[model samples]
Target: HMNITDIREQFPILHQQVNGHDLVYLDSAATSQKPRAVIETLDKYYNQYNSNVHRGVHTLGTRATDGYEGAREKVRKFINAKSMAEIIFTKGTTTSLNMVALSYARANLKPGDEVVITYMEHHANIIPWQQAVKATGATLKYIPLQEDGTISLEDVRETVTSNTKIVAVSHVSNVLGTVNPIKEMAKIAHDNGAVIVVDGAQSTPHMKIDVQDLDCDFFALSSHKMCGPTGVGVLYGKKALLENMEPAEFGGEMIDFVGLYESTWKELPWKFEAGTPIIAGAIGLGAAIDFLEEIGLDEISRHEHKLAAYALERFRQLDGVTVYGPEERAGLVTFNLDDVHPHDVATVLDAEGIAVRAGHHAAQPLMKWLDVTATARASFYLYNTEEEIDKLVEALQKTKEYFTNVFVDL
Candidate 1:
């Protein structure tokens, strides 16, 4: 069993107050609060060894290069990737997905070829594939969502066919908190002679992921959403596929040799990562991985699951509250109060020192499917507790009362 209070203390940001009350941060799905170790890792890099990597010859440069490469190894181990060369760093999940769509889809897709996804995908995952289909004269198809906000395997069997060249889907839904059946989906894709790509932004934070075990062709996730620094994310692809695909961006640091008329690119990973990369962010992510490992992902998942269940039970007791998604949600509760817009609800909750996300949540398709303009979501992490959920429940009740009184008077 993990010590909840001790885990909460690691995040210094959780110690503050908001709106004259103790802050209750419940937006880990948006971005997790960084621990002291992650911050210290960045500081150590800038203070002791600050130099560009890959081409540096001096001692500081060597140190920086080692640090950057060491971070890549950490990432490889984190996902249990087969080879270190298979892991490449990018700006974030959006950029990494775009890279796959632009580089691989552009070269491989032909007219009448199909790209399969689901209705529950984030805009990051959906738009890239849409663009790929448009550019290549292919088609984009979405597997229908079940009543409980999950894709049915029967629907998957029907939608994915020989015409489907690429099958992309999220490993977990950001809005619904549903963990998708990616391994089964990957097998379906493979059986149909297609490759499967997994959007792992939500899964990596709450679960233990082994990409090899999943047998996915490619997987991508963001660093900031998993207790790491911002502006960095990971793209893990099969080595053979990555080697054959063209680099999406071209410039300094990604070349083997250059001439006036012709230029050759570097080897795997580096060739895809054109120009200078995020050195400090990568180091911070490495530290974040270490920190998460020390606590163990299973313990983290269990804590958050308990917190989510408590929040769901408490929030549903309020008269105006209507929670969304299935009963078996991962670590979040998305809901809306009767007749109160999510923005107004968020504002009222903010006044009570409760932080939550209120919007389409970068999943407009999901919002439309749910038949709502927007919704408020409270996401939990390992650092969160039942007491924090209680505070949130009280704040949400107050929010409903305040909104109801104002509208009734008007």
Candidate 2:
């Protein structure tokens, strides 16, 4: 068994207190807290060898370039991508999705083509295709959600037909915590002669990902969401597909030869990386990957499943506490309290040093599908414990009492 108490100590920021209470960080969905290993790796990079990657011939330049390129190997193994050349670093999942939409979909799709996605997708997965369809004169379609917030394979079958050129979806819903069946969906799309692009920002941190097994043509995730620094993300595309698609951003470093009139782009991976890259962040991400692998992702995932089940049972006991999504889901819960706005609940929770997400969660279509403008979410991660969850429950009860006293009296 992985000792939860021992693991929590690896994160220094989690040791501190916020306000008069211990910081109850239940907002890992927004961004995860970095580990000591990740922090130290970044510090070592800046203090020892900080230089622009991939051109300088000096010692610092070679070391920096190695650190940056080595991180790609880490990501490749993390997702089990076929080749190092398949990995393309970007700003985040949004940029990775847009790259496909701007380059692949824009080039291949025609006026009669269609792109299918689900209502539960984050805006990162939705908007790229929306714009791609508009520019290419293709149609955009959606797969409806079940009442329990899960998507039916039958519904996926119905929505994706032969005319569909691209099918985009999130590996897991950030708001509903629903884990979609990506492998099955990928099979359906492949049968219909369409390619699938996955937004892995939410799922990558919590679970083990194998791209070849999922058979997705493209996958994208953010480093910040997975215990690394912000502004660095990975985009994994198949070799043949990437080789054929044109680079979306044009500038220095991605070119093979630049003349007065015409230019040839570089080989796979470098062809998409247009400029000086996120050097330190990539190094830190590699350290973070090492940390996670040492702990074992299977162990971490099992811990989170237990926490989610525990939270679900506890939330069911509270009166006027309405929970969303099915009973069995990922390591997050989105809910609303009766007679209270989500923002107000979050504010009261903040006073007790409890942090949770309160907003549309970048899934406006999902918000509309749920028929609510906003919701409160408490997400869990590897370093989290059941004790923290108990504090959240106690604080939530206190919030209810305090609001009842204040509102009922008026």
Candidate 3:
């Protein structure tokens, strides 16, 4: 049996006080807290094996190259991809999604083609396809959202047509915490002769994903959101599709042989990774994967789910509080207190040593759909405890009282 106390001990950042009280970090959806293992691994790489990858014959270069490539293998295994060549490291999920839009979408999509996505996509996932459609004169369409914030398979079946070339959607809604039926969606896309792309930013950290089982043409996730270093992310593509897609960027480290006139690019994975890559960042990500695996993702997921449910129940008991999303959610609770802006709520919570996310959360269309300018969210993770939830609830109540007092004073 895995010990939660021992697991929490690995994160040094959690062992501190904020605002004269214990810190209650409940914003893992925005970005997860890094453990000592991940932080120390990054320090170790910079101190010992700091060098440019793939072109160096020196000792440090070889070590850096090994570390970078090893991270790719770890990502492949983490997502259950068929080959390491299918995994390409990018700056983050946004850049990864843009790679598909610029490369594969540009190559395949033509005028009058249609691309379909859902209403719950992050701007990172939605805008790329919008630009792709504009560049190609293809139509950008959205599948309508249900009242419960989930997408219907029937709507997906109806929205995707023979003219649709790409069907992109988030595997999980960051704002609603709605787990999409991506497997069935992918099947629908395939039936309509379209390739499926999944933004796995929210789902990857909370669930076990098998790329092969999903059969998605592209999958994107950020390292920082999954207990790793920032500025590093993964874009997993089918090997055949990647082989046909051109490099999104051109510079050193992506060329096999460069001549005066013509140049031959590198093989799968390397060909897509252009310029000097994030060596230390990738190494830290690998260490993060190791650390998470040691704790077991299933256990972490279960713990967070229970915590989220508990938080939801507590929030429901509070008067004048409105919670968003379905009854069942992953690890997040998005809500608003009566007559209080989410920003004010977040500030008040911060004053009480509670950390949460406020605002549109990069899903502006969904925000508009919900008829709210913004909302406050408390997202849990493996390191979080029920005591922390209690603290958050207390802080929220304090916020309501404080706001009411300020209004009465005015």
> Candidate 1 lDDT, tens digit per residue, 60-94?
99999999999999999999998988999998999
| Candidate lDDT (C-alpha), each | 0.91, 0.92, 0.90
The top-ranked prediction according to TM-score is 2
In candidate 2, what are the lDDT values of residues 30-111, reduced to their tens digit? 9999989999999999999999888768999998998899999999999999899999999888999999999899999999
Give the C-alpha lDDT of model 1. Answer: 0.91
- Greater-TM-score candidate between 1 and 2: 2
> What TM-score, over all chains together, does every model reach?
0.98, 0.99, 0.98
Better of 1 and 2 by lDDT: 2
Report the Cα lDDT for candidate 3. 0.90
**What clash count goes with each model?**
0, 0, 0
Ranking by TM-score: 2, 1, 3
Error of 3 at 37 (Å): 0.9
